[PDB]
Subunit: 114 residues, 5 copies
């Protein structure tokens, strides 16, 4: 029943001119993630895990990022850092053509209770 | 309606060397954006929405970013993070040529009222 | 008004070091004038009102830390920074592109006490 | 001493983030105090505790667990960044492989 | 005086972090106080102490040691970023060489 810790939320990239969030991913200790998001948390891609373990494969059942930010704020978490990365993998075995994907994550933290 | 929450302002990437902002996008809870920007807020790309819901399709009528930063500062928001992401997409269906777009966003936050 | 945001940046591109060709200044004009004074070059956006906003001012020197120090003297703090990259086609019938990068630093001053 | 910086990072069933290995950089004595047995020192062994290393790595793969361990010892995350680098495939080609590196910077202030 | 900004950085490029050289930018009198004998000034000689440089560099290669020396003198890390820049290989080609640059911004407030 640990209260403090880090939680990361992110999304992969790739009308029309706006931001496109296909899915909001959640990473951190499972008990922390459950306390914040509750039933809006989809655990199907990593089911039946001990609450004190860590995961990088949860995701949310809604699409707007600011709603996830607000829910983290309601539970005492603060955004401390964020960054965006790019990854390139070859299309097939015998080509130089690649597929590019971006990953943007936001780091949240909650300090120990009083 | 609550007063705390997150607000994100951003623009798509690119009188030649200077910064080129074609449009200022606004994301977050709908009631917060209307309270901050008011008559300068354009909702045409997502109209007739409940004030307690979330959007990512509003935009501002002016184009200077620092003005939007100041209006958020008046209402009690503070900038907590910013990031820039790049993303690509194939032009045609039978080609590897791509088009690259850049996106820069600035995250703001306001605490609950006293 | 004494509070507000000021953004300084430069465009990407004696070989390994950091190459800064020009320091751009963005924000409310009265704030930019108060901070940088006569080091400010207003030729690309002249005869503007002090209460208006600009994104086309630039400085007469090139070392960024000197601009950082001047902002700090007038009560500004650096709150964020980011770097972006953009690409445009070289001509109309080609897929070749030119890549330019941009690094900016965000400063803010709170209202007078 | 007790204060100092520590950096953790990584080089980057398919939508999620792939963290192959968590790297640790900083003064050796600080890294051992924070991570202990979970610290793999095989690629840079038998070094003075007051020296600095860039080649330690952890025996687990979840980032937020490393973040939590740093938070237990009094460290705070003060910055994070991601970079990309490209190196030519061979001598007579323009092709190249791209690799990204995400970084998280931690710091603990001197004790009381 | 004693306050001011100082930036440290390096140019991009096993499976670890490769720092070829650590660059130091800021007011020259500040850089001397922080890094002292570890500071190499050969690429910007005969400068006035109250002037600014972007061409100093350090004699060691581990970033965290430079981080610790700065915080030991009262400096705090306030921001950091990475950038990528491309240039054409020659005049009649679209082939390009890519380089990355990561920097960390430090600051110290006026004395008491």
């Amino acid at each position: 029943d640990r209260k403090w810790g880090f939680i990361t939320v992110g999304y992969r990239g790739s009308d029309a001119k706006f931001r496109r969030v296909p899915r909001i991913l959640v990473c951190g200790r499972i008990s922390l993630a459950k306390e914040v998001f509750g039933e809006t948390l989809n655990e199907s891609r990593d089911p039946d895990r001990a609450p004190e373990r860590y995961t990088s494969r949860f995701y949310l059942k809604f699409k707007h990022l600011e709603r996830a930010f607000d829910m983290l704020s309601e539970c005492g978490f603060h955004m401390v850092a964020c960054n965006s990365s790019v990854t390139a993998s070859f299309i097939n075995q015998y080509t130089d053509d690649k597929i590019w994907s971006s990953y943007t994550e936001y780091v949240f933290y909650r300090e120990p209770s009083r």
